[PDB]
Structures are given as structure tokens and as C-alpha cells.
Design a protein around this ligand. Structure first.
Ligand code: FAD
Ligand code: FAD
Ligand code: B6X
Ligand code: B6X
Lengths: 358, 368
């Protein structure tokens, strides 16, 4: 029996896979998949700026995505919203075209399908790009997922396998381990896993130093809409901004990266920045409906790398600090914590993210 | 006597109220009163704007409405016991380059003849009146007797007042005009009918569209779309209604007492569409951030989009139609909130006396 605290994409995912491996699971979260995971664009390109250990974690998660989704859609009988029709990286000036050559050279060694495109061919793949486009890479095996549909499926699956969901705040950690809930009741389990995003470290009762600081990094994000999709595929455009089309006309446009503590106010400043970026690279998007503006807090860590594994406190694990890439990493995270729970050992691929490194 | 008012936006609630004030019996027909252009409107009340340099008739209409605003609000707040949201702490015009500073000298010269309080301000003094302006500000005029109203609060009061005086509100669409009987009337979506001794049409850009209207009776009141946004802070960010012009176009910025900050507006040709667009919102945000750099931090609380009621020559349409006992009051485009009160008087008088006040003659329907 494992108690998972926080039920965003990371903790739902851990909970599901733990169930898949015969364990008994309880998820504690007053509003599951309501925070960063609700707001997230869920883009899944092969890589990004953010280093070699983390790369190996990502590529593995990438390897696993298709099988993870399929296993899930089967259990839940729900769609998860994973699309694999490719990610397009587009560059708009010398400096960003330079970075793309660097990127190609980074990706080929690792058997990631990449296809360089000249300006002409960038425009043929996406007619809606601005003529100022200079070059681009297509990564046809990459794509995007809708985290809203993914977290819904995870819930359905967790339920189907008979995991419990307690929609209450965990107010305190208890020494077997357990948590106290806002309504006075307690939940203990043979293992506790903390996966509460930027609130993880804040839970009262945690022994000093047990969990590192998971600092919020605010991100505003918007969603445009049209009757039929406007953009052909997940598209990332740099001088940057990313643009994730959904099957139903939704078009996600992210993202600001800001340091504002726990604030999730949508600001004239934020929205203008995003709108400027997207209109710059997709001039026809002017008439697209502005359907939603929103703002989430990315879970950070002191060195900006994920925090997975055992704490100094016995039977108390964590799975958090995924910052900009939790949707991408969710599946590997769920395996690695699975194994950890069952075997008690730490898979090689996760060793670099132990908590004890601080 | 009994007048049926069709449409209950600011113009028609206003007409209905004043008509009641003058002893008449009134029925307002509107499925969603004050939900359209009047719901979205910023409600700015500066002394003038661009449409008035050339139209001396419309200027006179506006100035009269201006004269009347304070008395109209007071009479209303009394009857309704509600606040209407009228603030008179001034409108500030600010210029940000040569070309817009030139226009302001022109504006000063336009306004003095007409006994409108204006006070020119150098860059220094612009920044003292509004600390939040960008350093690039060049010059500005203050019009301390001007200001703004919150149309949402105004239209609520009008409703309360209309009720208090016992006017009827029928929350249904008028589907058809009923013509050629001893008295005029409208048919409603639910099959029922309402006749009255007079019908007044005041349905914005829908006015002309009502079925059963004799051809040519009402001119085309073409929709002119406008997107508009509202930012917010706990305490007001801007001291007063502010209109800022730079690099050829402008933006207006209307603070409310409670932190709301209205930012308008796009002028677009999209028929009846009221979609909020990346394009629209970006335009507005750009303009405001340019002239109020600190507004970056402000919450974006609302984005919205209304349809201004136009007319073939862009002037209001008030008075009798060729159809007997059928009047109109519409076509106020960008300035209906400002004109609402004079509109209400002029239509009042018209209803009671049967004659057309001089100030309104230039806006007769028959001019087409
Ligand atoms: C704008 C934006 C765009 C993004 N785009 C992408 C992208 O394109 N691709 C990608 O891979 N990643 C993206 N991410 C990252 C991804 O969403 C995060 O890494 C992800 O949320 C991590 O999941 P989480 O469950 O740790 O955090 P969350 O989703 O924040 O979940 C934390 C959960 O903990 C719960 N909680 C808090 N306190 C308590 C308590 N006391 N008791 C119980 N529960 C509690 C909350 O209710 C919440 O549901 C993006 C993030 C943002 C903000
Ligand atoms: C973005 C924006 C900003 C503005 N800013 C300002 C400003 O600063 N100052 C200013 O003076 N003005 C401003 N205006 C202008 C002012 O809003 C309009 O001129 C005014 O709202 C017009 O009033 P109306 O009552 O004629 O229009 P509306 O309020 O649109 O009247 C139409 C009404 O008729 C009703 N209706 C429609 N069909 C029927 C039917 N068949 N039967 C019954 N009822 C019906 C509708 O339900 C609606 O309530 C602005 C307008 C916009 C769009
Ligand atoms: C390993 C790929 C994970 C993709 C997330 C990429 C996104 C775009 C980028 O950094 O290029 S960051 C999403 C965000 O947190 O705004
Ligand atoms: C004297 C009429 C004042 C109302 C209109 C003022 C606003 C600013 C301007 O035109 O300069 S226009 C409101 C609109 O966007 O329709």
C-alpha cells in the first residue's frame, strides 16, 4: 500500500503504474490535475535547451510514450490525446538557424528521426508560417499529448484498477508513514510518495532537509481556437514560442517563464508577449478566437533537475521537480518509481536524480 | 398614452425612463436588456472626438447631452436609489509624438470657442497628473468637467428606475412589426402581441432587421464590431479617464472606482461577429503597454466584443418614420452612452408634443 500525495500528471501516473504492478494505492489531492498539469501544453519534442543524464531520462520516456498510452487507453477505454504526426522546429533568423544545425548534430547520434528543411520546405509543411522563415527540423516520430485528456484517462484507469482517490488536502506528514488530512482523518501506508508539485516541500511535519525546495516557476499560456485546425502539427518557433494544435481546433500557445512565487495571475504583460510571438510567426492567426488565458506553476528544484527516489526518511519517497517537462517525463517517472517501490532498488537511469544530492 | 420601446440597450432604457418621467405608460421589449454594445461599451465622456470636427450638428447634440449628464444622473440615482457610476474628475488627453501634439493644439482651438473647460499641459505636467504615463509623453489637454460613466451601472439604474415608475419589461424578442392597424405594435417570439399608441425602435444594429417593416422605413444600422478589454488591480492604477495618441492611432483607458480599467477599442468591419481575437486583443494590449508600461503587471480580467449601431452617413437616426406612430432612436455608433441622455429627452418631447426639437432636426430619418 502506497499513499501518493498530489495527483497532477506525475502522481496520477505513478499511482497508475503502481497499481499496474499489483500494489494497492491511495491518491490524496483536493483538486486532481488542476494546477500545472491542467495548464500544460503537453508538447513532446525529442529535446529542448535543458546536460546528459536528463537527456537519457527523456529519451527513455520518449521510447515508452507509445506503449504507455496504449496500455492506458486500453485500461481506461478513454482517449489520452497523444498525437505522433511530428514536431516541427522552425527558425526565423541567422542565430536560431545556427541553433538548429547544432540541434541536428545533437540528435542524429541518438537514433532520433530528424529531417532538416530549407525555408521552402518549412513553408510546404506548414503553409501558415510567416515568409521570414529561414529553416527548420522535422522530428516525425515526436509529437504532443493533451494533458487534460491524459490526466482524465489516468483517473479512469486508477479507478478501474481500484485505487482510492481522496479529494482532500494533506495538512501534515505523520511518522509506517502517513498523512493527516484537513478534515482531521489520517491515511497511513507502507510507503508515502510525495508528488505535489511546488507544494511538495511545503507540507508541515517534514523533517528539515528531507525534501528540497520545489520552487514555483510561473507560466502563462493561452489557447486560441478555430472550427477546423489551423496548424498541421506541434510547432516550435524560435528567434521562442510553441504552438500545439489539438484535433478539435484548440491551439495552445506557450509560454512565459517567470519568477513570481505562487502567483498565477494572467497579465496584460504575459498575454501580450504570447500574442506578439504567435502573430509574428503565424500572421493569419490574427482572426483566431482567443478562447482561454491561464497560468500555472512549474515545479522546480535547486539545480533545475527532477527529484526522484527515497528521502532520508524511511519509506518516504518523492517524484517531482520536473519543471518544464513533466508531461514528457511522466511515463518514465511512473516506471522508475514503480520499480523503486517493488524492488527497493533504484534503476540506473534515475540514479542522477536522487534526493540525497543536496 | 402608451409607447412600446423595442430594444433595451442604453438608448432605449433611457428613452423608456424619460418617457415614464413625463407621465407616459411604457413597455420595453428586449430578451436580454443591456447585453450587447451597451454591456461592452467603455462609457467614456470626453468633451469631443474625431467625428465632431466636421459635423457641427452632431457637436451641438453632444454638448447638449454633456450639459444634461449631471442632472440626468442625479434624477436617476434619486428614482432608482442605485449608483449609476458617473465620474466627473476629468478626462486627460495625452500626446506622444509631434503629429499627435499638433492635433492637440487643434483640439484646444476647437474647444475654447464652446465654453468647455480645457487646460493645456506640457510634458512635465502630463506626468504630474498621471504618474503612470510613459516618459516619451510630449504634451496633453485636461478637460476637468468631463469624465466617464460605467454603462453597466448606468443601465442597471435605468432598469431599477423604469421598474420603480411601473414600466413593463417583456424579456422576449420582437419577431415582427404590426403595421396598418389603428395603432402600431410588435409580435413576440412566443406568439403574443403588444400594441401601443407609439412604437419606438431602438434595437441597435438589429433595428432595421425586424420583419414587417415597410421597405425604406428604417435605414440600415450596420454593425461595426469593437473588441475591448478590462484590466484590473486592487486599487486604481490610473487617476482618471485617459485618451492617448501615438504613431497615428489612439487608445482610451477608463478607470473605475473599484480597480477595473477599460481599454478600448478596435474598429472593425465583420458584420455581426463578436469573436474576441488574438489580433484584436494584441492590438489593444500593445497600445496600452506602450503608453502605460507599468500596466504589464495588471491582471487581464475580461476580453469582450460588441457591435456599434451605424447608419448610412454615420450620424444618429432619431424621429418619426414614414410609418405613422413609428419612431426610431438608434445609429449612435461610438457615442451612444454620451448621447443617451439627450436622446432620451428629444424622444420624450417628440412623443408628448409631436414636434421635433431643433437640436435633433438634422437626424430625422427622412434624410435618405
Ligand atoms: C504553461 C506550461 C506549459 C507546459 N508545457 C509543457 C509541454 O509542452 N510539455 C511538457 O512536457 N511539459 C510541460 N509543462 C510541464 C508540466 O505540466 C509539469 O512538469 C507537470 O505539472 C508536473 O506534474 P506535477 O503533478 O508535478 O505538478 P502539478 O500538475 O502541479 O500537480 C501538483 C498537484 O499537487 C496537488 N497538491 C498540492 N498541494 C497538495 C496537498 N497539500 N495535498 C494533496 N495534493 C496537493 C495539486 O492539487 C496538484 O494537482 C508545462 C507547464 C506549464 C506551466
Ligand atoms: C467596444 C465599444 C466601446 C464603446 N465605448 C464607448 C464610449 O466610450 N462612449 C460612448 O458613448 N459609447 C461607446 N460605445 C457606444 C455605445 O456603446 C453604443 O453607441 C450604444 O451602446 C448603443 O446603444 P443601443 O441601445 O442603440 O445599442 P445596444 O445596447 O446594442 O442595443 C441593442 C439592444 O436591442 C435588443 N434587441 C435586439 N433585437 C431585438 C428584438 N428583435 N426585440 C427586442 N429587443 C431586441 C438587444 O437585446 C440589445 O439589448 C462603445 C461601443 C463599443 C462596441
Ligand atoms: C524533452 C522535451 C520536453 C518538451 C517541453 C518543451 C517546451 C518548449 C521548449 O522548451 O522548447 S517547455 C514547456 C514549458 O514548460 O513551457
Ligand atoms: C464625444 C463622444 C465621446 C464618446 C466616444 C469616445 C471614444 C474615444 C474617441 O472616439 O476618441 S470612441 C468609443 C468607441 O470605441 O466607440
Amino acid at each position: 500500500h502506497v499513499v501518493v500525495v498530489g495527483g497532477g500528471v506525475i502522481g496520477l501516473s505513478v499511482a497508475w503504474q503502481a497499481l499496474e504492478r499489483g500494489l494497492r494505492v491511495t491518491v490524496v489531492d483536493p483538486e486532481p490535475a488542476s494546477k500545472a498539469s491542467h495548464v500544460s501544453a503537453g508538447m513532446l519534442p525529442a529535446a529542448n535547451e535543458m546536460q546528459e543524464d536528463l537527456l537519457r531520462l527523456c529519451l527513455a520516456s520518449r521510447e515508452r510514450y507509445p506503449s504507455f498510452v496504449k496500455e492506458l487507453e486500453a485500461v481506461s477505454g478513454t482517449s489520452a490525446g497523444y498525437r505522433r504526426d511530428g514536431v516541427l522546429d522552425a527558425a526565423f533568423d541567422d542565430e536560431s538557424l545556427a541553433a538548429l544545425d547544432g540541434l541536428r548534430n545533437f540528435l542524429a547520434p541518438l537514433g532520433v528521426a530528424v529531417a532538416p528543411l530549407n525555408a521552402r520546405r518549412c513553408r510546404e509543411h506548414e503553409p501558415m508560417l510567416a515568409e521570414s522563415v529561414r529553416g527548420g527540423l522535422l522530428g516525425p516520430d515526436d509529437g504532443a499529448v493533451n494533458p487534460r485528456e491524459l490526466t482524465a484517462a489516468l483517473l479512469a484507469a486508477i479507478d478501474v484498477r481500484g485505487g482510492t482517490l481522496i479529494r482532500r488536502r494533506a495538512t501534515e506528514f505523520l511518522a509506517t508513514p502517513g498523512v493527516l488530512l484537513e478534515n482531521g482523518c489520517a491515511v497511513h501506508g507502507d510507503r508515502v510518495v510525495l508528488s505535489a508539485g511546488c507544494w511538495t516541500h511545503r507540507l508541515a511535519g517534514l523533517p528539515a532537509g528531507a525534501v528540497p525546495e520545489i520552487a514555483p516557476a510561473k507560466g502563462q499560456i493561452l489557447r486560441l481556437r478555430s472550427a477546423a485546425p489551423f496548424l498541421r502539427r506541434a510547432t516550435r518557433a524560435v528567434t521562442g514560442v510553441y504552438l500545439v494544435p489539438r484535433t478539435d481546433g484548440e491551439l495552445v500557445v506557450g509560454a512565459t517563464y517567470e519568477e513570481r512565487d505562487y502567483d498565477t495571475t494572467v497579465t496584460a504583460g504575459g498575454v501580450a508577449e504570447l500574442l506578439g510571438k504567435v502573430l509574428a510567426v503565424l500572421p493569419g492567426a490574427a482572426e483566431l478566437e482567443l478562447a482561454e488565458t491561464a497560468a500555472g506553476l512549474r515545479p522546480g528544484s535547486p539545480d533545475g533537475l527532477p527529484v526522484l527516489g527515497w528521502t532520508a526518511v524511511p519509506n518516504l519517497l518523492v517524484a517531482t521537480g520536473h519543471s518544464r517537462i513533466g508531461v514528457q517525463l511522466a511515463p518514465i517517472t511512473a516506471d522508475v518509481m514503480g520499480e523503486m517501490l517493488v524492488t527497493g532498488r533504484t534503476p540506473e537511469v534515475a540514479k542522477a536524480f536522487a534526493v540525497d544530492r543536496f
